[PDB]
Amino acid sequence: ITGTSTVGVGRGVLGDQKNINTTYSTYYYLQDNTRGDGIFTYDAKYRTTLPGSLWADADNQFFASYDAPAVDAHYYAGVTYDYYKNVHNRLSYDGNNAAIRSSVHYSQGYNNAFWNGSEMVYGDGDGQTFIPLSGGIDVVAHELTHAVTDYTAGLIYQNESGAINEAISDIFGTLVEFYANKNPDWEIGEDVYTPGISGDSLRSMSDPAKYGDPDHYSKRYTGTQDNGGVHINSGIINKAAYLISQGGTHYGVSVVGIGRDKLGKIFYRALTQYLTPTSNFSQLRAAAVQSATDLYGSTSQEVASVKQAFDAVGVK
Ligand SMILES: Cc1cccc(C(=O)O)c1OC(=O)C1CC1
Ligand SMILES: [Ca+2]
Ligand SMILES: [Ca+2]
Ligand SMILES: [Ca+2]
Ligand SMILES: [Ca+2]
Ligand SMILES: [Zn+2]
Q1: Where does Zn(2+) bind?
Q2: Is 302 a catalytic residue?
Q3: Cα-only R_g, the chain
Q4: How far apart are CA 5 and CA 38, in angstroms?
Q5: Domains delineated in the chain
Q6: How far is CA 126 from CA 34, 112, 244, in A?
């Protein structure tokens, strides 16, 4: 909308108060003009037609329970923008400050979030498996990273390129969580999964097997469900990325950690310069080793750790 930029206040899904950038034109809309060509958050009103209506509020105060998913989708889209701009010099998902759009209250009791090719979409959860999914910053940043991947490597969402697509979203989702520094971890979705159960998550990067995903190529899934295991086999790559950053010994193979900033640099470079739509795991290894060689030199610790990490998860 055309209007004047202002700053509203509200509470997110977990009850935290935060300020949000809004736009005033009769109503106050969830339109942040301070980032690129805008971040825009929409109400799908429990239906499935998208994007729905640009979120409007009469008084620029967002403290209603119905407001909470919108506040977080909006706020965390901003934090993610900031991450990509400040850490990788990338402006929005297309690198040209494309408008970021999100819709919340998608469908009824809907336990998923996704990127639909044009925007982010969040269900409210059914209250048992999930609470509103924009309440997790790693969820929001995972979805916006699907947009980054689509504009860069374009990894097809099937089989090994699909599992890499998924792991890239888990990796940068987690790096954004760490950038924002509130209760960061290498788990995915913990802030919105199973409100009845503490300490679990949808996936773990540090130990994928805890939630049934493989941590070694030899345990990869080869059937056809989940588009060929894209959310499953992503555990192999998630494990490698965890080891590259934090290090460890896995099936007897030791990895020296090099930290999250260098992890992010190496995988951002592989994502934007070397991976292609049909890259497989072995090709990812090659791209990450070359990216690290580019950045730190062929005989660096960084290169050595990338190789050790891929070795530890059985990827040659
Ligand atoms: C919750 C969910 C369901 C289906 C697909 C995705 C998807 O984005 O691939 C999804 O989100 C995630 O995987 C992580 C939690 C954000
Ligand atoms: Ca209000
Ligand atoms: Ca966390
Ligand atoms: Ca997390
Ligand atoms: Ca839980
Ligand atoms: Zn995903």
Answers
A1: 142, 146, 166
A2: no
A3: 19
A4: 11
A5: 6-154 (3.10.170.10), 155-315 (1.10.390.10)
A6: 34, 10, 36
